């Protein structure tokens, strides 16, 4: 049916078919959606492939696959600065012409068609409100239809109490830190973590304020009952193996998937009974570069529609993450305060200038800073500044740079989590 696909394209360009009536990704006739970025239809299988593959990136820093079909044969990487898009040869054979790909390769300063200064081309034209349609495209994920999260009426300000947080997969205690940044009184912060360095970070930065536990799997419902009623349960599954960035992807939901279900079980164990109308809240976090059926199983078990949130709107990193949860105003648009640095250069140390305006964490572009006519890594304190941590946040113990960077990378973006936890001030006591 490949010949029929190309044939269909021929019929389109002869004005016998509309380009909007065909799926430009794989040539299918089962057109349900329109392609968000460019002109053409979009079947549902290509939607699922687009969900999985569109934000995957190679070790290069550029896209793992083609932007058009999320697949393709041999891609054409873009020479424009900060752009990481890839266009495979086979799509450019259609949309630009069967002689213009070969002549565009010879063009050494080559810009891609999302970055093309002209914008309009013969068979391919860029649709205008594509960031708006990209945003809407995740609200377009209504395949998993659910009921909205239950809205509890606000408790009066004299009756408010300090919040009690169960934080699974705590890491470097981002959540408590953000709660302290908001000025919310915290009665107790129970944290389950395994890596010693992260335990250590938390112990030191939170002096006499955190009770530590062992393995999440070991934690029983009896433990959950006996450690007081919890008012906020937060957690995020490991995205080291779940991403395509790790060269070692022997499975996809061996290891990390198990640990998600641990969050699921302890969420039920900490959930108050029906008839117990006390305000309870929960947040789960995961990375966007994930499987569709993975995403479906997660959304079903947590019984909720995810909300993608990218940190570019508030911080100096590209940190797009799914958030499941019932926190009020989880959907509402992100606001970046003046303390938050939207340019990378502001997060740099003195004596350092950045070519990039945003770095994405992973002779080739491995290190993102041009200091003293030399390519160099972001310093660990700068990576802290990129995610909005307080300055020198992870300099607790005698650990290596590689380990400490790695520690930093896994963490939630601090202004994003400030944006999510901020309406909890309406429900709990302040300092």
């Amino acid at each position: 049916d490949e010949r029929t696909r190309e044939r269909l394209v021929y019929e389109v360009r002869q004005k016998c078919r509309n380009i909007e009536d065909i799926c430009i990704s794989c040539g299918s006739l089962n057109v349900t959606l329109e392609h968000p970025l460019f002109v053409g239809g979009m079947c549902q299988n290509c939607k699922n492939c687009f969900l999985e593959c569109a934000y995957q990136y190679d070790d290069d820093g550029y896209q793992s696959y083609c932007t058009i079909c999320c697949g393709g044969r041999e891609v054409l990487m873009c020479g424009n600065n900060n752009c990481c898009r890839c266009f495979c040869v086979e799509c450019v054979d259609l949309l630009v012409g069967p002689g213009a790909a070969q002549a565009a390769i010879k063009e050494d300063p080559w810009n891609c068609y999302m970055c093309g200064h002209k914008g309009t081309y013969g068979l391919l034209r860029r649709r205008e409100d594509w960031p708006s349609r990209l945003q809407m495209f995740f609200a377009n994920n209504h395949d998993q239809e659910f009921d909205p999260p239950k809205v509890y009426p606000p408790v009066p300000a004299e009756k408010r109490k300090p919040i009690r947080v169960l934080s699974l997969f705590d890491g470097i205690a981002t959540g408590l830190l953000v709660l302290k940044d908001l000025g919310i009184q915290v009665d107790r912060y129970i944290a389950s973590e395994v890596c010693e360095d992260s335990i250590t970070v938390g112990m030191v930065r939170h002096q006499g304020k955190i009770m530590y536990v062992g393995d999440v799997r070991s934690v029983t419902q009896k433990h959950i009952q006996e450690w007081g009623p919890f008012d906020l349960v937060i957690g995020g599954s490991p995205c080291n193996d779940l991403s395509i960035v790790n060269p070692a992807r022997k499975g996809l939901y061996e290891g990390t998937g198990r640990l998600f279900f641990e969050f699921y079980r302890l969420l039920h164990d900490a959930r108050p009974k029906e008839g117990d109308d006390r305000p309870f809240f929960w947040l789960f976090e995961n990375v966007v570069a994930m499987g569709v059926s993975d995403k479906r199983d997660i959304s079903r078990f947590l019984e909720s529609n995810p909300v993608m949130i990218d940190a570019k709107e508030v911080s100096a990193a590209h940190r797009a993450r799914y958030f499941w949860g019932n926190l009020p105003g989880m959907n509402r648009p992100l606001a970046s305060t003046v303390n938050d640095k939207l340019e990378l250069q502001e997060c740099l140390e003195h004596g350092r200038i950045a070519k990039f305006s945003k770095v994405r964490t992973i002779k080739d572009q491995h290190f993102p800073v041009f200091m003293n006519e030399k390519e160099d890594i972001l310093w660990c304190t700068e990576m802290e500044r990129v995610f909005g941590f307080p300055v020198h946040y992870t300099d607790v113990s005698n650990m290596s740079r590689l380990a400490r960077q790695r520690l930093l990378g896994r963490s939630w973006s601090v202004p994003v989590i400030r944006h999510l936890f901020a309406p909890l001030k309406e429900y709990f006591a302040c300092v």
Binding site: D59, E74, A101, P247, R249
Partner: protein, 347 residues
Amino acid sequence: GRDLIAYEVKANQRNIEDICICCGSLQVHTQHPLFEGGICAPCKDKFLDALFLYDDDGYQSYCSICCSGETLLICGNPDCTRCYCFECVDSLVGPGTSGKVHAMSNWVCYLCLPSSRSGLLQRRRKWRSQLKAFYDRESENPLEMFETVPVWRRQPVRVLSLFEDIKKELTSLGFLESGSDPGQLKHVVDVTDTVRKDVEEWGPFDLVYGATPPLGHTCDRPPSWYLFQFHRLLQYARPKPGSPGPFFWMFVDNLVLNKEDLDVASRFLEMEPVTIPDVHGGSLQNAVRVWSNIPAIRSRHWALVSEEELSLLAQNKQSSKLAAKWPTKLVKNCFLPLREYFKYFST
């Protein structure tokens, strides 16, 4: 241990570049050119050996990752010669993938289209260039070596062929068109009056070929004269300086010029002759001496065939009453690497 790597990268969270994917060695000399990973020093040597080695029918001789000819998986793209092995596909991609691939029979390989999910094996971007750079830095005495061309970027090949028409051969190698009236090869018999202006008028050329005649003399002009005419018209057909496109040249001798004239020719074409025999039953039926820049022309050389035996062959074949036939099959397979540089099509 080829099987151990799936633990080493997954459980020990270790970079693929620190282990040898081709065998499972932990000490790597460098990185693998085509795919993501390291490569150890004997595998590096093995790879460089096997690099452009193909089979007689057309496809690559060894397994494109590890260079194992023992088991082979043929890719299902007519414009891809890359052949693999089972041990790699299951070791690097996951435990039951090579049998599924074998049962597909319409399977495009990794290089063809990587949209298929891969377990551990990642394809390097730009890999053609990386291959070229690898050969440059890693071969001892590197040679005239051109970057391999992407398949859509493959144009039809422009051949000049002096004193012997190669249209039949390269058409049978799918390199030349049977349906074209404008010929994509220019055969010339007599070059004696030819000027640089004339070779330039005939268009640019991609491949230049020239050969001495066999023993039955069509003319009495001495065998050195053909060699020198080849050198001249070769210097004429050279591409204008600054050209990135791949230019090749291949001179062939049917044992017809003696050692003194052979030494002169070795000097003027700036390498030693490659002898490529026809051995049937262990017995030397025929042989031919070559000079060319074509990849892996020099690893077809047979250092077993001595000069005295070639003098004996020349004496025995001159004194026979049989008409002289062009030894097509000896130099035929010496054009196979240009598949990876120039546009093929078959019927």
